[PDB]
């Protein structure tokens, strides 16, 4: 998971299995989904 340089606190999904992490709000990577379903696909 890539939080990024920004300091927002946005919960996003990433694959391990599909779990949550705090996304900073900018410059997201590919392993960053808005839902678990999209993440598991």
């Amino acid at each position: 998971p890539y939080t990024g340089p920004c300091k927002a606190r946005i919960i996003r999904y990433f694959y391990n299995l599909c779990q949550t992490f705090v996304y900073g709000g900018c410059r997201a990577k590919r392993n960053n989904f808005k839902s678990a379903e999209d993440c598991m696909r």
């Binding site: 920004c6 927002a8 606190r9 705090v22 900073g24 900018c26």
Partner: protein
Amino acid sequence: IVGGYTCQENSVPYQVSLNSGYHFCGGSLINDQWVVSAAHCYKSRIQVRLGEHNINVLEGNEQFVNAAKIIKHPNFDRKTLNNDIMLIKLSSPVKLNAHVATVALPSSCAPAGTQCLISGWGNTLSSGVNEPDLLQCLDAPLLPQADCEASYPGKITDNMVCVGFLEGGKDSCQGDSGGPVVCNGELQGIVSWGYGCALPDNPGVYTKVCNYVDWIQDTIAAN
């Protein structure tokens, strides 16, 4: 906020929490109907919470008002974060009191070395995660632009200013974004970005509010 201290109950009355189910960013009340935050904190639906101290407990002094208009700077760049500023118009004016107050816009750009106060409900750990219940405060100086540029080679524009310590230890963090940097009673900065939190040679980068006073006033008068 990493390396800070819990702010004294309602000593930071202009601080607001942006909520869309959970707290995700901070902001500052500039007048009874307008909130200023960071453009990267944008969301189509936002509820503004004022008078907060413990964001996880209903204390009785909080005001909950929904955003009616959210306006980002027309020149905001999501890649470089240049012009990371946004205005929020509230659904209705708020009630100003001891717990809820406005903060003044800058009269001029504060010089390097000026001591400021940064606040927010963001992560308190440089390594790991600890979300505070209570609002955190941090006293830190405005850094010389040359040190800012040296810390982030070719990434600093004239609309950004560095605040903090080149040695790390104290810094704003995820969840602090959009929050206030107040120096001598004036809002001079908005928490924007940085590489990690409280790491040496990488102090926080903030939006230089003094470069947007006219845009702010012009937008408020037109909306």
